[PDB]
């Protein structure tokens, strides 16, 4: 009830669990690719694995 008061009131809980894994990525950050280099030394990122 609105009459419950602060600790007494309802609170919405979200838990975001993640299947953070080396298996097929499908949900990712506000993130955008480069071209792919081959046969030269580079920093790299795939799916935010780096």
């Amino acid at each position: 009830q609105p009459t419950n008061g602060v600790g007494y009131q309802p609170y919405r809980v979200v838990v975001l669990s993640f299947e953070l894994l080396h298996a097929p990525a499908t949900v990712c950050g506000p993130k955008k690719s480069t071209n792919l280099v081959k046969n030269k030394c580079v920093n790299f990122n795939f799916n935010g694995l780096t």
Binding site: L21, H22, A23, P24
Partner: peptide, 24 residues
């Protein structure tokens, strides 16, 4: 009727490539 299972029912643990390797 009945029979021994022999070596049926092995399956992949995960979507990771590995090769020429013994693992457990």
């Amino acid at each position: 009727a009945y029979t021994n299972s022999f070596t049926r029912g092995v399956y992949y643990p995960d979507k990771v490539f590995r090769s020429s390797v013994l693992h457990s």
